[PDB]
């Protein structure tokens, strides 16, 4: 289908052990990846530093879950500038959760979104619907709505480090998949959006994940639509099987 | 006057780089601090690896500078299990910037300290009014209030392991330091709250230390009150000045 760079991204939440993941770190560097993919794993803070020291698969990258964009007073959290000292220089933002629990607006996800832009960061940056929103038929817009927000504050240029991680609020760790017909139908409109506003040459090499109960066994069966890039897993991604999901995207 | 055990303690704040961490351990490291004080450093989550395995002073601790109750589905955070079985066992609670900027109220400051104190941690919760109260004479209830909302959720035995900053919020960052006078006002009358409310046995422990734009000039007359055991800095902390406020609680 000529499609771009596929992407595997594991997000561990707020949760792992030293030695857990000193177990799962030896899995994943002992699988030998044979195709072209970038895989992903975003770790908590704490732990950055022992999965940068352990982490030896090289079709990895480290990303943070989250960060502010500027150093200064702010208490707890960790700011981009520090991020780039330390050698991580990806990272999720406006992820489902913290838009929920921690309030993240749009504007201001949009507005960690350029700064991390303006750092060299590559981002993954999460949309989606929940189900009220799916129910009154209200899905597409309030996709378009988020990445219009997101798109107001970035270049042209800026999209070369973008990319965005569909997903619907009520497929994360729901044990609830969006069939790949409802994932597929969301990540062309995004596609058609971006490549009529933006470029048709951007919205051509914009890896789109699908994202919300993604698992070994439904990954396949995800990839093989023409607009579904990839996938942000969060649960699955605390297991061996997360092999078989990178494998996935062969 | 018979007082407590000293605290002095460090709040980087989101500030660091690791060399200019490596930098100022390496100051805090040579310094021979000769009485009885617990030192403590608060460095931001991603530079706590660093801090562990260069910092070598003694009279010295880690601490977080925040955290969740509990390890989970919360992209971006981090809890407080995992910080146990990191070695990091203080953990810096309702700070001031948390309370304002990310939106942290009295209940839920309240709930992250009954927590951390059921999690075995060592906690320092911060407490203290703003210029707009401080002039409707408001001071004195707030901080009342701030404290009995914690008090609510803890055991007579969890204030073993609790330690209370009163950093005004007008003098945080300001360059505005509370004369020692205003801030013995307000220790007393903590001293004398927790000492009716829960034990003269307990207020007769319990470290209060003040905070807001304190300095090794003024930390030493901050020091000399009855009341004050100690001191929770922010920017003074980024610098070999902080050698001297430690000394000042000598």
């Given at each position: 289908?000529?499609?771009?760079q596929?992407i ?6 707020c949760n792992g052990?030293?030695?857990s993941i000193?177990k799962?770190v030896?899995?994943?560097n002992?699988h030998?990846?044979?195709?072209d993919?970038?895989c992903?794993?975003?770790?908590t803070?704490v732990?950055?530093?022992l999965v940068?020291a352990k982490l030896?698969?090289?079709?990895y990258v480290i990303?943070?879950?989250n960060a ?10 960790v700011s ?5 000292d330390?050698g ?10 913290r838009?929920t629990?921690?309030?993240?607006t749009?504007?201001?996800?949009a507005?960690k979104?350029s700064?991390?832009?303006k750092?060299?960061?590559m981002?993954?940056?999460?949309i989606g ?5 799916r129910?009154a038929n ?7 709505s988020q990445t219009?927000?997101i798109a ?6 800026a999209w070369?480090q973008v ?9 994360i760790?729901?044990g609830?998949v969006?069939t790949?017909?409802?994932?597929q139908?969301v ?7 971006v490549s009529?506003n933006?470029?048709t040459?951007?919205a051509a090499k ?10 070994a066994?439904?990954a396949?069966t995800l990839?093989?639509?023409?607009d ?5 897993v ?9 092999r078989?999901?990178?494998d996935?995207?062969?």
């Amino acid at each position: 289908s000529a499609k771009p760079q596929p992407i595997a991204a594991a997000n561990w939440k707020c949760n792992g052990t030293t030695a857990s993941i000193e177990k799962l770190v030896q899995v994943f560097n002992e699988h030998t990846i044979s195709h072209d993919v970038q895989c992903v794993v975003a770790p908590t803070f704490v732990h950055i530093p022992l999965v940068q020291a352990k982490l030896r698969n090289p079709k990895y990258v480290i990303s943070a879950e989250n960060a502010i964009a500027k150093s200064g007073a702010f208490t707890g959290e960790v700011s981009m500038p520090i991020l780039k000292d330390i050698g991580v220089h990806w990272v999720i933002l406006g992820h489902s959760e913290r838009r929920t629990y921690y309030g993240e607006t749009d504007e201001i996800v949009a507005q960690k979104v350029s700064e991390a832009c303006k750092q060299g960061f590559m981002v993954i940056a999460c949309i989606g619907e929940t189900l009220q929103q799916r129910e009154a038929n209200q899905t597409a817009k309030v996709v378009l709505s988020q990445t219009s927000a997101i798109a107001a504050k970035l270049t042209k240029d800026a999209w070369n480090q973008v990319v965005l991680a569909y997903e619907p609020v009520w497929a994360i760790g729901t044990g609830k998949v969006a069939t790949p017909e409802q994932a597929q139908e969301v990540h062309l409109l995004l596609r058609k959006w971006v490549s009529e506003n933006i470029g048709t040459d951007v919205a051509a090499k914009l890896r789109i994940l699908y994202g919300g109960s993604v698992n070994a066994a439904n990954a396949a069966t995800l990839y093989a639509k023409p607009d579904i890039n990839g996938f942000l897993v969060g649960g699955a991604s605390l297991k061996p099987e997360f092999r078989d999901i990178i494998d996935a995207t062969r």
